[PDB]
């Protein structure tokens, strides 16, 4: 039900 | 080797995945996750293989690899 969540974190 | 994807398992079994550099301090992931849950960061403990992830820990330091799991637990009472 939830969509895939991918977050890119800044360095 | 540069970026890896870490899977953060929420308390309700929801997941948020983060792409992070091997040298990024994991504070940034902890803050982002807490922000996305709408809870104070200090109400949470983030565990890798059952061990507490400190703000200054990095994936390289902790030995993390692609698709490794981080678990989010509520902080313990008094912690």
Curated annotation (Swiss-Prot), chain B:
Note down the stretches annotated as region (Microbial infection) Interaction with Tula hantavirus: 1-7, 19-22
The Ubiquitin-like domain covers 2-79
Q: How is it modified after translation?
A: Cleavage of precursor form by SENP1 or SENP2 is necessary for function.
Q: Which GO BP terms, alphabetically?
A: cellular response to cadmium ion; cellular response to heat; DNA repair; negative regulation of action potential; negative regulation of delayed rectifier potassium channel activity; negative regulation of DNA binding; negative regulation of DNA-binding transcription factor activity; negative regulation of DNA-templated transcription
Q: What keywords appear on the UniProt entry?
A: Acetylation, Cell membrane, Chromosomal rearrangement, Cytoplasm, Host-virus interaction, Isopeptide bond, Membrane, Nucleus, Phosphoprotein, Ubl conjugation, Ubl conjugation pathway
| Keyword set includes rRNA processing | no
Site feature (Interaction with PIAS2) residues: 18
Q: How does it assemble?
A: Covalently attached to KCNB1; UBE2I increases cross-linking with KCNB1 and PIAS1 decreases cross-links with KCNB1. Interacts with SAE2, RANBP2, PIAS1 and PIAS2. Interacts with PRKN. Covalently attached to a number of proteins such as IKFZ1, PML, RANGAP1, HIPK2, SP100, p53, p73-alpha, MDM2, JUN, DNMT3B and TDG. Also interacts with HIF1A, HIPK2, HIPK3, CHD3, EXOSC9, RAD51 and RAD52. Interacts with USP25 (via ts SIM domain); the interaction weakly sumoylates USP25. Interacts with SIMC1, CASP8AP2, RNF111 and SOBP (via SIM domains). Interacts with BHLHE40/DEC1. Interacts with RWDD3. (Microbial infection) Interacts with Epstein-barr virus BGLF4.
The protein's job, in short, is: Ubiquitin-like protein that can be covalently attached to proteins as a monomer or a lysine-linked polymer. Covalent attachment via an isopeptide bond to its substrates requires prior activation by the E1 complex SAE1-SAE2 and linkage to the E2 enzyme UBE2I, and can be promoted by E3 ligases such as PIAS1-4, RANBP2 or CBX4. This post-translational modification on lysine residues of proteins plays a crucial role in a number of cellular processes such as nuclear transport, DNA replication and repair, mitosis and signal transduction.
Family indicated by similarity: Belongs to the ubiquitin family. SUMO subfamily.
Q: What is the protein's given name? A: Small ubiquitin-related modifier 1
Q: Which organism is it from?
A: Homo sapiens
Span of the full-length protein shown? 19 to 97 of 101
């Amino acid at each position: 039900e939830a969509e895939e969540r991918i977050i890119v974190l800044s360095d | 080797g540069e970026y890896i994807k870490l899977k953060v398992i929420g308390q309700d079994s929801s997941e948020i995945h983060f792409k992070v550099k091997m040298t990024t301090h994991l504070k940034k992931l902890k803050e982002s996750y807490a922000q996305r849950q709408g809870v104070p960061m200090n109400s949470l403990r983030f565990l890798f293989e059952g061990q507490r992830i400190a703000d200054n820990h990095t994936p390289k330091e902790l030995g993390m690899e692609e698709e490794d799991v981080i678990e989010v637990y509520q902080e313990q009472t008094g912690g």
